[PDB]
Amino acid sequence: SKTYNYVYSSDPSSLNYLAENRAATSDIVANLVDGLLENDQYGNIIPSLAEDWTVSQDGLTYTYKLRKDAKWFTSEGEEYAPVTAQDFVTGLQYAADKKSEALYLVQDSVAGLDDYITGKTSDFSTVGVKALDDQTVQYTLVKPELYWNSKTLATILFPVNADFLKSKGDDFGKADPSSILYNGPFLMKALVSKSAIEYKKNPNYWDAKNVFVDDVKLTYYDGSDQESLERNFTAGAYTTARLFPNSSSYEGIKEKYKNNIIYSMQNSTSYFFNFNLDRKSYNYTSKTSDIEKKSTQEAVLNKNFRQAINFAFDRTSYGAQSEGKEGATKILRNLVVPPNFVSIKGKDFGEVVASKMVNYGKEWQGINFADGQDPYYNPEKAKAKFAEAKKELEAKGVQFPIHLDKTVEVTDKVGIQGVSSIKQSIESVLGSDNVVIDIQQLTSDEFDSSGYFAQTAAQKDYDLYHGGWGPDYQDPSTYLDIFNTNSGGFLQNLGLEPGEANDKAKAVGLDVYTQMLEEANKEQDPAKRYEKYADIQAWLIDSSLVLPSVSRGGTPSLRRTVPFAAAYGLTGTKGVESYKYLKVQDKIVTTDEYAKAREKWLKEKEESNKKAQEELAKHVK
């Protein structure tokens, strides 16, 4: 038997792929449930449960033909029932009925779905998903979406068996392998909080031939023993290992593995810092007075203040805490939309955003948004912006310094160094008589419930947050919509609730931002549409409501995985998240072997993408 062994860091709150928008859930379910389409090794969208599909000439009707040999299985591997088109009707009705946190992916796209979710109608037969027969599912959209098929790689568009769902009721989708049915490459054999996630290859999966490992075992990793990754790799227990050049052990590791260290490419997941614009919870704070809390509440609404923090935040120093001195810039990401995410007549998105910055003030003159460098850090600009913020805030009675709470997990030693670097950088540039970053070290449970797994904006217990977005579909709106005041998926992390559009959101212009998103979304020509989203991304950078930080990837590893065997996707949950396609080998890959494979993959990706674009036209009516 061939096994992949490594670690995981995030336990899921549930397995409810229809109701969750957290990667903690979809990273797991990517291995357990398939949707209509998936990815190949090159990022092409290829058949999954749907063996064929058509789109109408007006772009509003998508029809999918499901393969007859796809079945649902229990967690023990027993066949439950064939997959049918009705399962996609069931899945969408359930996502709507449960008010899924990912409803923004479909609520404004599928005909009638907004009316049903919001109570304008009560009958799901008016919603644009239909099972025409057992093998044929048909979606009806409100407007054309060239990116619609990419959306089927998001879990809210995955199927569910209605009888199983009914039998389970509120038990459906709990963090228990028996809470869902399986139609994907693996069965979940173990899901143990703070201990293990274990997958077993499903021998009767419709595409079992493309699953090259029989078992996947992930041991819980809390960040307290970073040397354990290479230690267990070298002992033969892990298949891969992420290296930490700051560790005392790195000198010896690099001498042993001089020809084996492999750096991954930066990918489309973007991280950024944001502020809590309407903080309600103060369990984790170093502030002791209402004047301090009100002073911070006022400061985070002040644009000059946010820009001063932006220009005082040394991203190189931050990156160096995990990547070491020489690799410090390899992870840096300077927009929310990756600069190469789309192109506009051959110009990259980030270049167009840079072009738009000329209208947002001298403080952005000459900015370059390329990955892998820090265009923000600028102490003299930061100090000048802060002086302006301080005059504005003092006129309101604000007391200085402004204390900003940032949380970190007590066991997460690299994360503690990261946040310590941001404290040092900001306080060094602006002065601790002006800003203090108060680091709150929390237990796992406290870190989870005040942050990523908080269920309301009111439970967010911090002034600064560091989270990120993985794109759900191939359009800049997947990133830029997450701050809109009507339905933004990231709004709670800013302390705001979708719908409200309250005084604080208006104070920082997020209502204007939301209106801009609405206008840009109406544009159907891709070049024009992308140009409008570039202006929207420029507005957001200028607003400094986000402080772009890092991406995933760009990091060193040792590997016994076969280079570029796995699936890859720019968006969705069927790429690197999936252990389908992945292969393991005995030999530790060399840097030179990886480089040769990378150049081969880069060349083949362009050829394959061109073929894929050709194949697309055969599907119109």
Swiss-Prot record:
It is a lipid-anchor. GO terms for cellular component: ATP-binding cassette (ABC) transporter complex; periplasmic space. GO terms for biological process: peptide transport; protein transport. Pfam families: SBP_bac_5 (PF00496). GO terms for molecular function: peptide transmembrane transporter activity. Its main location: membrane. Keywords: Cell membrane, Lipoprotein, Membrane, Palmitate, Peptide transport, Protein transport, Signal, Transport. It comes from the Bacteria. It is found in: Cell membrane. Belongs to the bacterial solute-binding protein 5 family. Part of the binding-protein-dependent transport system for oligopeptides; probably an oligopeptide binding protein. This is Oligopeptide-binding protein AliB. It comes from Streptococcus pneumoniae (strain ATCC BAA-255 / R6). The lineage of its organism: Bacteria, Bacillati, Bacillota, Bacilli, Lactobacillales.
